[model samples]
Target chain A: PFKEVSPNSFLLDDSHALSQLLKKSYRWYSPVFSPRNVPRFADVSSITESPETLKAIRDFLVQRYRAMSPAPTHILGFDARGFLFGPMIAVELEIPFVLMRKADKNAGLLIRSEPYEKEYKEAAPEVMTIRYGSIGKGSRVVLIDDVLATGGTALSGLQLVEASDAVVVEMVSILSIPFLKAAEKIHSTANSRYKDIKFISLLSDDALTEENCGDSKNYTGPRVLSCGDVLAEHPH
Target chain B: PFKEVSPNSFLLDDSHALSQLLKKSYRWYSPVFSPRNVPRFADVSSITESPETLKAIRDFLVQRYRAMSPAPTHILGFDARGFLFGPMIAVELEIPFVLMRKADKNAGLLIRSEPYEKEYKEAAPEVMTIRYGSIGKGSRVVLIDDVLATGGTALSGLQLVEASDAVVVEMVSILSIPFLKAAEKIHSTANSRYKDIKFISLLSDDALTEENCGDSKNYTGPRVLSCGDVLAEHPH
Candidate 1:
């Protein structure tokens, strides 16, 4: 049975995977904002992941793909982390960024919508705001995040832009676990729905087995390895 | 006497200068994983800015001023914004940003103090979280913000950093108004007590005052110049 956390949301089971992925990490900081609606738990997440962490993640994916896409890029959505890297990535890519929300939001002209989910039961209809003008029409966009799971929150975010008709090139994650794959149907659905739209990530997981995951298929990829395995690389 | 909002914080005789500086053509957006602090009518005594907002404000400043011997960055306390950018700017300049707080947060660490006047109230005693490691050390680091007025917050932030032994590079703002200049006496006093920190901005009152702002200032800086102005420029 699924653990009911909130009104329509259920927790996934994968203790070992979480243990491994989170072990190499020191401590998990509490969520900076709300715990739901796709929280980026600052504690578990690295405010700064030893440069080696990003380098290792990037190297592994590069070798596996045998070919690298244009220098790896990250696109973050707003009213927060986007402030961290939205412009940074755009600067690195030499491209203009499309803000999902502008500063001091001016109420009219822009098209916005609300998506309902248990994560946002308190604030029904997640008000998805956009700078309709700043986000050029027909702009090929990429959705970025610090982490990805369940695919529910990401879906709602994408829906916000999709409604505006911008081509969502793809969604990428610094890390994504196995449970998100359950929404593969939506992934494929989004693909066919926006034919020109494509998705890619420096790191992605196809599946996790019992060795890595405690049990069950609800894997969320990072659990692909054991904590001992990750620490093994450091060999303290 | 200063109007006390929180203990000793007070509203300035005027807030126009501070508001104009922050509201300049520059965009305002909350940083992800940072507090989106902004002064609401409800409370001007508290740090009107949030952690996320502070990140955006600091980013706007540091980006504009890239120089050697720049202002040393330091956090007055363990602020969410302080945590996010303190280390970030330190890393960028290869400096260690130090921490100063209202109280002795953790054992074994040195404690520091400073005073601030919000709305003219003498609110002091900077309390903050413990830093996991060193940041903004031996480097000039600018004190950053979403807004600077009466120079109280900036002064206190600068002093807190200096007390911990980090250099106060300068007081940078996404916005600052004229009255803040009058309050500079307080900032200057904080400077002599700590490290000297200068102040600067992208635009001045020209972008603010109803009669002179670019939307009233007329600088042709990056903005959606008035409709008539655009037509005059392109004639299309």
Candidate 2:
């Protein structure tokens, strides 16, 4: 009764050490359903912060993309979260890297602005803007981020690059929540808009859900919980 | 009579190829002042993006910091802007790195938040927060950023680390505006709080000003300017 998650996506079970480290570091909260019913919390900083994890991701990128056509001219990463792995990949490739920062009250010319929606509304308006004229026209950029959960974040990034008339050759994430179907949505959006864009991720998940954990929306307490304990409780 | 701008801080004059490259790539507009009159328009992506420049920086860091106590357990970069150079340094050192993100509508356990005012205010509330338990106590951290203009940004980063009970060994930036006296302010802040923290920059500037450029209050244009032209207008 086993089936594939997505056409080009693969899950990381307990078979790999990276998978185990991620699962142990993975955290969850009550009211698993966000106000919008999307699963709320996901943290991958631990995995990204580890040198070993970074090395493997870098090697994986090289092997998978050592022969990319119109070879990537730059490694572009979203602000904050994407910032984590973007530099590592850029270093591995020895290419230039640029960051897409959050729009702020700062006084400066912002080149492009793309509005995005998060799975949870609690966050900011979710606008991503790059410095005016930061990226040159026709530059081939590869996007890197830590997580691709809702697809909104990555889509906004794609829109930003396309607006500049630049090309996004590919996108890579350290992990994705396949159950959320974010990867599927991102692929569709990219194909319809950019003709073709490759999406690659190191890990994916399927067992995380509100049905797997009880609804304690209003509950607030501190305890280190395991991903298995929560999944085992609900038999997902 | 010449007065020293900042101790241990050096300017990027035309004598150096890197300095020339940076100046040509620098952009600015008038009213050169932000609402706060802080002379905010400075971009170094050109320098940071160049593989040669990055490799030079990595070598410089290795030569400068090859010997240090506690050995820099991590590289902590500030949100958005600071994120740019942080990863490059972390990758060079082969060390784990973390980010201090701006406060927003995102959901997660933010360990600590410190509010700061910058030379200008378009950026955001200027909040600095780290993920809960991202950095361990007694760990040595080296902070990285693209520019150190007013010292407020670096101070906020130091405060965030100390709040976590972690040690900030040093802070490095690609550029610093020494005439702003940010270094003095940062030294005062760090001395009083962190006890002892070192600040370093690859380049320093004192040529940008409203007085040197006419029509300061209302001026906008599209011209690639050089640091020499600005400094020539007012012999600093």
Candidate 3:
């Protein structure tokens, strides 16, 4: 019992249309940290079904991850959806992949266990002793997450890695909300404090556009930007 | 006050020793259904690192895992130890990496869950879902486990992959005991019934050798070929 729901199909049904509209309304935030990071992030996230796309993503990552000073020895820890791509990214970079598991599995040895102070409740995040090996004193790593929101989860992961005596080379994410306070916390605390660490998110948006407005209309990139500059204002 | 124990290192001081002896003794009763499976069990149980032993061990595995399949997809599942080598293996194979999580951490769609089975009062194994977007269907997967004695855990993993309709190209373990009846049963059942799935374990020992014979010891070697040879000669 399954129904095909591609991006195009999901935008057509009124109920799904309404749902997508509401989703668009909910202040979706992505932060563009750098012009330098954009091409790389765009390159990694571009949707494609060809072997060329796969190799491009893999090679870009291997280069970016390696170019980092002191280079990564183990995984670039990713969260939620980041875990989805993070492992893939690590594989491409030829480094080990790790994640801050949401909770204790009660099976493997607890490597670093600590309670993260989230907005709602105190939750423990356990960095599972990733195979190949656990993080070590000189371990160089990168933290990758899908989105940098309030920055609590990523912050928790950063703390977890630091506690293990390993260094977090960079924090990479696919999306970031530009105006979110997490950016402030990440900059003031995560940036200036860590000194050696770098934080980045790829596809960033300032705020939803008026084009993403109206009760009857919603956007899902409903129109594929196969060509032309999306940011350039047309003659109006 | 924490002790550093290699998470992969099974705590087989004396209790483990006794268990090994018991397992070895059972071999006699079982009659080793296949004569070709008989290994010249050795007794150098306590020879310290023999020079380039670590390199030899790693080389042997790299060669064997590589030989099992030309382009191997090393799927290192979750939990720390899994992450350790999962990414490295995937890097070696230049394939995508995926994880089976123990919990659904707030990703609100199509999350697959497989509850751990309880046996003999053992803690219920953790239930987790495995997901691979492009790699899930018909891709050759080499499943690696740290140790394969009972083989129940690996079997559980095999079942999970089957749930996703992915073909398990092969299964390998860093170490295993000879005459692990449970593993034999699973292997035979997997074959004759499903595809002729090839499984291998790196080290094969008679479980307990006269390595315990007074001042003598049991060691692994020509008394055994690699674990791959043992599995390749399955049901002989």
Evaluate all candidate structures by whole-model CA lDDT and list the values in order.
0.37, 0.58, 0.42
Summing lDDT over every window of 10 consecutive residues in candidate 2 chain A, give the lowest-scoring window. A222-231
Which digits, one per residue and each the tens of the lDDT, describe model 3 over residues B1-236? 11112222122232333333333322211112111222332211111011122223334445555766455554634433344334444544455555544433211112244433556656456544442242354566666654465665566566655654566766655446645654555646635343354555434454445442321124222221222232233232
lDDT of 2: 0.58
Worst 10 residues of 2 chain B by lDDT: B222-231
lDDT of 1 by residue, A69-188 (tens): 443222335433433333334433434444444323422233444443555436433344544344444555656554555554466456655554444655655445544552353445
**B1-236, model 1: which lDDT tens digit per residue?**
12322221233222434333344323332222112333211111011122233344345434544444444433222232233333344334433334322322221122233343344454443433223223333544455543554565565555444433456555544344554462346534534443234555333433443322112133334322222232243222
Off by over 4 Å in 2: A1-40, A102-127, A131-138, A186-195, A207-236, B1-38, B103-125, B189-195, B207-236
Off by over 4 Å in 1: A1-27, A30-76, A101-110, A119-126, A150-153, A180-236, B1-140, B146-156, B159-165, B182-195, B207-236
The local lDDT score (0 to 100) that residue A29 gets in candidate 3 is: 15
TM-score of 2: 0.71
